[PDB]
């Protein structure tokens, strides 16, 4: 398949600003190569076609260019209606005709630590045999965050799950909800559980922790 | 105005089938190419295959590993996908969309898949699980702000819902997307950041409903 490298896949940004995305492909495509944009929870909308020809309703601001290898969507005024996830698609081979791997347009504040909380089990779960060990990184920004859980001192890997929530109406903040999953018996053995975050907003990670 | 809705989806069981169902409407269905595309939860656009108007071509992703068939009954504005085989991995949004076909500004006589994809319908979301109904075991997130919450863990299939106070609280409340755990069954959590001041004198209560298994649940959250 015909490889399609988009970058950047985050860019926040803020009214006013212009944005440009970059799509290239492993092998030459010519001018067949088209940009879509996908808000939350909708369907993709076709915005150029043959590299640099816009669909009917597209606004003017919206613009691409390029050929061969190397393409190029730019929005030269961004409003509000633009935050969107956007794609590139190259339409010169098939199968399979593939897509970029998305640009994820948001509304540009500034840096925020999160506020980091760590949640024991209950007493409840324990009882049926699980412990759930829960961090929380509360209202950060931007959405880029890592954590790592330590069992007295041991870096747990494969044994947490994560998710993170739509970044937020009023103060353009994410949060983040991290699971640590172990047996109630493995629970019993340990003392110290701890949840380290790293986040551009802190210059050393922060770690939270309680002892069972 | 011109449109493509889907329909056909829903829950299957790992190794079993389904039909997917596309209509269009206001054009004429026969003179155009048709595509399939699909969005796994969280992921980018993946293109799976394709049909000419004619039906005497078709393509189909490597991902669909040869196992799915696309169709179309133009007397019917119709176009299907048979997936067989299926696969938790095959979880995702469907979409059905149109050729634009030509590089002018309004296509008469419509070529193949060059110039991109200009109608997309809504989707139909397709979950592949072997798991059983059931409802949630709701557990406390016990807490100058603090944090609380509830962890709502091992329930089957999506939706839940949660509510603060039944409704009343709303502000600084964080309701996370779930995550599938390796058994099969979601796990979701919501959160609210309050000021600690209010801990000894304030009643927090996570109202938790999973309408699939009739399963309702007020949970009261206090200091352990």
């Known amino acids: 398949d015909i490889q399609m490298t988009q970058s950047p896949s985050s860019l926040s940004a803020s009214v006013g600003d212009r944005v440009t995305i970059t799509c290239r492909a492993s092998?030459?495509?010519?001018?067949?190569l088209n940009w879509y944009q996908q808000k939350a929870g909708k369907a993709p909308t076709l915005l150029i076609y043959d590299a640099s020809r816009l669909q009917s309703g597209v606004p003017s601001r919206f613009s691409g260019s390029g050929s061969g290898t190397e393409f190029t969507l730019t929005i030269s005024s961004l409003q509000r209606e633009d935050f969107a996830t956007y794609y590139c698609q190259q339409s010169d081979s098939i199968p399979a005709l593939t897509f970029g791997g998305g640009t994820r347009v948001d509304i540009k504040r500034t840096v925020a630590a999160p506020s980091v909380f760590i949640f024991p089990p209950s007493d409840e779960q324990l009882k049926s045999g699980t412990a759930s060990v829960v961090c929380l990184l509360n209202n950060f920004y931007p959405r880029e965050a890592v954590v790592q859980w330590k069992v007295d001192n041991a870096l747990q890997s494969g044994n947490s799950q994560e998710s993170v929530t739509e970044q937020d109406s009023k103060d353009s903040t994410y949060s983040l909800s991290s699971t640590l999953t172990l047996s109630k018996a493995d629970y019993e053995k340990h003392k110290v559980y701890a949840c380290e975050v790293t986040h551009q907003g802190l210059s050393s990670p922060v770690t939270k922790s309680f002892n069972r | 105005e011109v449109q493509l809705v889907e329909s056909g989806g829903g829950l299957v069981q790992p190794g079993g089938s389904l039909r997917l169902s596309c209509i269009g409407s206001?054009?004429?269905?026969?003179?155009?190419?048709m595509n399939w595309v699909r969005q796994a939860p969280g992921k980018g656009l993946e293109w799976i295959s394709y049909?000419?108007?004619?039906?005497?071509?078709?393509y189909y992703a490597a991902s669909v590993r040869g196992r799915f068939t696309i169709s179309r009954d133009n007397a019917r504005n119709s176009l299907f996908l048979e997936m067989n085989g299926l696969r938790a991995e095959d979880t995702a949004v469907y979409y059905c969309?149109?050729?634009?076909?030509?590089?002018?500004?309004?296509?008469?006589?419509?070529?193949?898949?060059?110039?991109?994809?200009?109608?997309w319908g809504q989707g139909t979301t397709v979950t592949v699980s072997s798991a059983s109904t059931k409802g949630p075991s709701v557990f406390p997130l016990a807490p100058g702000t603090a944090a609380l919450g509830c962890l709502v863990k091992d329930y089957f299939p999506e939706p839940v819902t949660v509510s603060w106070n039944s409704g009343a609280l709303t502000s600084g409340v964080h309701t996370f997307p779930a995550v599938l755990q390796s058994s099969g069954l979601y796990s979701l959590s919501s959160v609210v950041t309050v000021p600690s001041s209010s801990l000894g004198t304030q009643t927090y209560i996570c109202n938790v409903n999973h309408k699939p298994s009739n399963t309702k649940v007020d949970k009261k959250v206090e200091p352990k």
């Open positions: 049909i000419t108007g004619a039906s005497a071509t078709v």
């Open positions: 969309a149109r050729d634009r076909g030509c590089n002018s500004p309004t296509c008469f006589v419509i070529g193949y898949y060059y110039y991109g994809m200009d109608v």
């Open positions: 092998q030459t495509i010519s001018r067949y």
């Open positions: 206001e054009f004429t269905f026969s003179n155009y190419g």
